[PDB]
Amino acid sequence: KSYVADSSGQTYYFPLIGLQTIDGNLQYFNQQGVQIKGGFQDVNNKRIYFAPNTGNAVANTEIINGKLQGRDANGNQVKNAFSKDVAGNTFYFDANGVMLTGLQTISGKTYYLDEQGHLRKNYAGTFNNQFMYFDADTGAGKTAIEYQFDQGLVSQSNENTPHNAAKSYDKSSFENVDGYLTADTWYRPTDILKNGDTWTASTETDMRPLLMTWWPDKQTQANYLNFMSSKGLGITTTYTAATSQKTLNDAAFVIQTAIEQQISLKKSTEWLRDAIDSFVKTQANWNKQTEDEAFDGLQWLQGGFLAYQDDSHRTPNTDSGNNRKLGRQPINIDGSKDTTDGKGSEFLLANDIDNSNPIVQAEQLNWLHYLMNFGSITGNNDNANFDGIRVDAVDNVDADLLKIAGDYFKALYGTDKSDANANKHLSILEDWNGKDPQYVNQQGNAQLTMDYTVTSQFGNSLTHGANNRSNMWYFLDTGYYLNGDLNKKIVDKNRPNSGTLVNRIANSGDTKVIPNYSFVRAHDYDAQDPIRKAMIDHGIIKNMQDTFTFDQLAQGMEFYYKDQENPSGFKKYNDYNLPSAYAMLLTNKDTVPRVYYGDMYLEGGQYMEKGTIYNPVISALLKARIKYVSGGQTMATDSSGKDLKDGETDLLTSVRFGKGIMTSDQTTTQDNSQDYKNQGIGVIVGNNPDLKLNNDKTITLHMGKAHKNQLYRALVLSNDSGIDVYDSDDKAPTLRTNDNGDLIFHKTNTFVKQDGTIINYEMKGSLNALISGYLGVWVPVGASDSQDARTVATESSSSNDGSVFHSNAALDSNVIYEGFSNFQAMPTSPEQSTNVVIATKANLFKELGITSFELAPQYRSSGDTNYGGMSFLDSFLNNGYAFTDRYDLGFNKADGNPNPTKYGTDQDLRNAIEALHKNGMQAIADWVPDQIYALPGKEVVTATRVDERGNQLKDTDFVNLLYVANTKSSGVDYQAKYGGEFLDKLREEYPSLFKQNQVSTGQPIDASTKIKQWSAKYMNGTNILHRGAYYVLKDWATNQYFNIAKTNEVFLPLQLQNKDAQTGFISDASGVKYYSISGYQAKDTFIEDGNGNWYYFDKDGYMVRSQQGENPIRTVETSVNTRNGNYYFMPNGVELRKGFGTDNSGNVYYFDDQGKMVRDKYINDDANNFYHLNVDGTMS
Ligand SMILES: OC[C@H]1O[C@H](OC[C@H]2O[C@H](O)[C@H](O)[C@@H](O)[C@@H]2O)[C@H](O)[C@@H](O)[C@@H]1O
């Protein structure tokens, strides 16, 4: 007794044969038992059609001879009736079986069938030379002469009106924001029906919800009544917008009575606050349904953005003084790409700060100063100050901030004077755009660009994917040379701007190159997604944007760790070949490499709690970098392209020569220094774990003619169970270079230890947790214990080019450590806080050659606070990127008690910074100017719904609407204490910083105004807060928003002022008029009746309606611009929607879901009919 489907999809029911009716559905099965689907089959004397997927019997039409015929569900042909086809079209067939066409009267009703014989529903036309609307239900012609609105003009005032009216028309008696009212506003009524018995004058604390007494429309009123009924306040009820106004008002009062009884019973109103809050979120105008939540682009993070507008008439506190330039990223600093995808994605997260405003620019510099002098200012400790910065989210802010930061460092530290000054304040950019490197270099390299081209290639060739990987050949970028000729090496001057940033095929330091940092992973690259995919994969969460708890994170982390360390060698979430990647990263010339905490220690749990399996290898590479890495570079592959010839291995060989050795063939230094002889390094790496060499094949490392006949020993060698690490010359296998300086390797190798036994080793691809491919690193034997191959930076003015950083051996001697993970657990104890640990362990990083320590952002997390909209992981994981107070870096509570960040107190931070200076390392401050989270104070902004670049969404009604945002800072926080304080001192000492014009604005920064308190006027926008398009209350009739700010310009519903509010439709000799629930006449506005029909009322206050012999199509231009367009109003004023309408001359048009005419496009139908609309609107 079940259906089963085959591999093909044929279906049996156990098998039944012939005509049968399993579960009441008529089906036909062939003699072999297969279920008939999507065809006419003949059973008995009646032909039946069976449906495509279900196989159930249904009406259908087929063409017999040349005439359409109709077949019903029972297989009988249809005569004198309507019958459908599978597509969904209805036809009518006469007594002779033949389909009818055109205008037809049957059974005393008139239907319109088009040429194809399709019954047309929701179709307006002058059919009999007289208007006729064909029903949406059955297609039956009505004259559309009867008015469909059910609500006549009625007065609402009665004996309770003066009691429930507002005590006062001002901020005393009305909960409000900037004067405006909200759905969840409570107010002070004149009197209170205490206990449902006796009316008594109200006391100032006797506040009541506005929704107890007033509603924006009948739909909302009916929903309120039904909702409150369901909570014990009434016998559960169903009311509709169609219910009479009188009945709804009476029912509101019986609910009011019941409410006052439960207030007396509970002696509280908090239960009601929660009931109203809940109810309000139920309504679409007061929730995200009217906010157009979307997830494409950066909207993926939080669900969509609102851009604030400069609107001095309604919302003047929120005006930006014409300073809200969006998307001025480096490539668009001047707005010249505003109309293209080259406009920057200004909106990223939370409240987006307006960094195009000179006043805000000054404040960002104040903050920058505070960070670079944090120790001096907060502990009077001149050794506890940050040395350099990381600029977060470069492409999501105004690029002026780069110049501001650059020039500040020039002024205060003379970074443009020497490499020693510059390199004492190492500064990096998170600048992802592929054209940022060239911009950064044109602007003098004030901060180091990242080099994504190399990070990307690690992804393709090693780091990503179990198998199909780009060849190691791609690391060379041979196109750099003309014709890709590795023999002739003529640089291609006319190259297409496509390639890796720094060529390393034969890098002798002779050509100028763009200084940069590079990495394999980051706190925000190849971490956050895998870690979440793992949680999703094990059912811990459902979505990437899902909120998770720390325990949820801990459980997921256990699977992540299990996958990372899998002995199989396969990795589902984690990256492959990280050792091999680091080997290349750490040997490359002309880069400052950066190392990720999470490749050295586990990304979760406690800080430095447990090393990763990669730790030993990376640690060795790092120490070897200090000893051996210097001089020129070469790089080659046993490969010529995408595809491999017979002998070819695609094994990459990277070499460094030693201090002053720049070339393969250079035999000695120009200054006759000897340091080079025991320096240099050789790296061999493969991406093929199933690699086997031919017996003939030999693989060579050209260590250089400065290293003829020299003995080399292994640092690191891969094998089938792991990667061996050799700590000193004695414990490793040796091998000697030939006369030309080449180390030769074969399929089979017999190496000898310098002293001790022989060793056997195969050039063999391996597969295990540490590698999927090959890795060999070789170093010269005889290296001193204190050997240091690094170059000190020079104090002389090397360059008059104006530039700050220069890619050279001194810059290359640096190493940045990104020393945190976003997924660290919260400290279990004060002693295990990241910054305490960093202080005790500073030593360890000095010996790995770290010259600059990139610390996590130290700002106080906004945490679980959430005023609306989607929370982001930065906030609930307390990682420091999401913060309320920019100057609170772990200060104590005002009561004296400790109040650490996730990383510890402010003292812990100053101690951590000092400890790094005691060990000769710099400390990097994360500068995060793009946004700020969870501001506790509300303001009313004028907002438009936009995508990441601040462009209005295409099909949105959310345009210039009033919205309550959380934009105002407490005014009593550390932003209030330290805001703008250091600027005056700075203007006095370095006037030019304050006189220099910025590019995007034409203006200099403006310190004449200090920011102690944030507010909307300094913001570009916000992520959508799920409050609704009309949470700020508005009268539908006049479209004016209620307000009580100034007694001269009050606007309230008339009930609340104890005046008479009449509401409904009323006819007069001229036409039909409408009065809203608040008692105002509708003018120049669209109005919806209780049955769902829509009407437009013109300037004069009269419903628009079509006349006989005239065009029913009318052009509407309203106060509400988004609704402008061409509409089709019938004689009873009803707007045609989602259907075709004929004009007086016989032309057909189509009108959409919302009544607007559609032009210049194709349009589809539920029955699969296609139509075209010309530009003038007509239907071809
Ligand atoms: O991203 C740096 C990269 O740029 C070019 O190659 C791009 C891309 O070429 C194909 O799509 C391959 O499938 C990828 O692996 C390459 O990344 C340069 O040709 C390449 O040398 C360089 O690494």
Ligand SMILES: OC[C@H]1O[C@H](O)[C@H](O)[C@@H](O)[C@@H]1O
């Ligand atoms: O619901 C289970 C379904 O299995 C199949 O796909 C059969 O064709 C269908 O008749 C049935 O209802």
